[PDB]
Amino acid sequence: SSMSVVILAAGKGTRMYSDLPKVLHPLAGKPMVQHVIDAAMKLGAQHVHLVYGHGGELLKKTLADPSLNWVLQAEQLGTGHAMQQAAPHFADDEDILMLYGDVPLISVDTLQRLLAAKPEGGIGLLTVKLDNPSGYGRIVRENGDVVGIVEHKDASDAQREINEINTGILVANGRDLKRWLSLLDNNQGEFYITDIIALAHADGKKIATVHPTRLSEVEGVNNRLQLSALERVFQTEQAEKLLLAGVMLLDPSRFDLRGELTHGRDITIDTNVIIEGHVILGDRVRIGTGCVLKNCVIGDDSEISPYTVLEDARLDANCTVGPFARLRPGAELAEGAHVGNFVEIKKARLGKGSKAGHLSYLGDAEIGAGVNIGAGTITCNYDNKFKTIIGDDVFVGSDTQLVAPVTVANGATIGAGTTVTRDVAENELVISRVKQVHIQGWKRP
Template sequence: MQTPSPVAAVILAAGKGTRMKSDLHKVLHPIAGRPMLLHLIDAVSALEPARTVVVTGAGREQVEAAVAPVGAATALQAEQLGTGHAVLQAKAALADFDGDVLVLYGDVPLVRPETMRRMLEALHEDGTPSAVVLGFRPADPAAYGRIVAGSDGRIAKMVEFKDATPEERAVDLCNSGLMAVRAADLWRLLEQVGNDNAAGEYYLPDIVLLAIAEGRWARVIETEADEVAGVNSRAERAMVEEVWQQRRRAEAMAAGATLIAPHTVWFAHDTRIGRDVTIEPNVFFGPGVTIGNKVAIRAFSHVEGATVGEGATVGPFARLRPGAVLAPESHVGNFVELKNATLGAGAKANHLTYLGDASIGAGANIGAGTITCNYDGFFKHRTSIGQGAFVGSNSALVAPVTIGDGAIVAAGSVVTRDVQGDALVLVRPESVIKPGWAARFRAHMQAKKAEKK
């Protein structure tokens, strides 16, 4: 749905985040493998905003570097003088913008585009409110600012918790801080905001009171508390992560995937899952994963930067690292690790194997305990295994090396030279059996031990 007028977003990200106890800026701590600020910017992008301005402060260099690739502008709040003061720092960046402004917070990353659209649509409803505030009703209102409003959503008063009376603190409708305001109203009203309050700060919500004093009105619309959950500590980050994961698990199941124990599966922000996929308990997806239809991911597998083709099987206890590509109907079994390796259609590596920097042809079978020795201490080298090849258990393939189509590598071989197609390579000492030797050895050693007593 198109918004009625151009949209700009101002995202506040100037706070120091001292409770995170981290050298990484608070808004750059990841949710599902992606900085929370970028989650929010991505949601804003669904509105096709004319501009997005991120207000920075402490740790500005980190934030500026993070948002530059997505085309967001930045504005500096050199002193932390409150939310109203922070928004005002974006005025220069939006000096020639005439439209609706969304005020958002970089540490509130789960706001949906649909909720932002509702705010903007409410700003243009009959009666044209001066501002729309996003409210919520948490289980514990705690120290949130309160919104006093009528049943029609018209705001009578907004007050910070520190300044609220006992009666106002008894109100359970809380201010998320998110707001939609016309640009012309926003800058005019912000210039009038004072700091005569318990914190000595310039509060953004005061623009609502100023508008009401002018004879205009503002309204509140509500959303669920989870959507406006903020992150000020690592514990709160974990709670927001869990909310995001719950959403994603529900989406995966609604789209046709079976999650045996949903609460134990962890997705990344960009995980793509096909239909009729079965995911067993305790599976972790890192960024960059695409799973085709009818794939089975067995328990305790870790998948990152990998593509898994239709009908393939992974795990249990498998690890797919970046660059792993599994063709349709291929199998990766327990305690198998792939890195920058391609497993051809129907190929199998079912047990205790490492395949790094390798290409394995269709229908090949890799025996238990096989490794590709891809690193010489300085450089990585590739191993190529042909279609239908058979590599026996406990073999070491010293790259660079090629095993031809249909070749057989005998168990226990250390292969250092190329093997032609349909050949057998056997690289191990000939067995030597000495009858009775073990018994004679034990007798000799027992007698020697007795002499020392």
């Protein structure tokens, strides 16, 4: 069929104490409002209408999304008024679902039930019964029949016992909806969206209701404490989905996914790992404690040792990296390569079974197979930046500075503490050798 959504996101997030529009605040590293858009997209939402008051410019900025239909608003004067501003935008043949930019966790199932329990020429309304309903809108039924919503405000002591409350999420045909809207008053001073419930039982239509499966689906964010609770809920969910799909998390409450994780079989992730962007892990990969991976491919059987950071990096199968290793964009390890502690790799490839074990920096480097990069080796590659190249079976002594552009051919050997400015030939040894000078019985300060 046909269906569009409207996302309300116009209020003042005063209690966020922020210079950033509330709805742009991230949940698992992405704007609250994008979770809602994402969901709308998953419904088949043909169009998405976003209603905003202040924060306009950097809202549409921080949200590229050229596919969206933006809707300005005088200055927050009515949640119903807001719904009026987008009213002329609803095609009469399409359903119109209403969501809030600060309720990021609303599941598709719960909406794709709402859209099924909508009575022809009527409203599908999402509701939840509360433990303590001590301040929300009551759902007022007569014979279990929805007739209208009561604000906690004007609620008799008898009504205040009504557990079931309004999530503020609901459906209706675009035609019928255009109707019910601009037939409402302002006599708080504002216009309540609540009213279109009674103003629907008015002209004899039936308003049905489904419930969300989790309370968190309809949790609204007014402040950061609330947002952090939703972050935890969201992370527990992701973690449990990975556990059930075969990934071992040594402590799923100390795990964070902010993006996507594609994975193979029998992966172990230890405590306090964070996964950002899109990470692909092969079979039998092990990630130690404290590692941060962002936009990485890690090949079958690789081991990432504790406290290793990787971003836009690639490891083939059987590699080992860490502890205390830092791989930056362009870092590439060929099959069975090893990078050790206090080693940084930038736009560099370390070939098959090559080793860089300690205290080294490698950038803008093409290194071959079976190469030994001694402790303390530095590509001195900054003066743009220049390329260092090393063939197979090369031995690079400790504390060597490779001054690029420089090429060291296969089988070459480089003595410790050597500066290399000129190219090195196959199987040639090079030793930057001076003469250590001796004073006898020297009195140390």
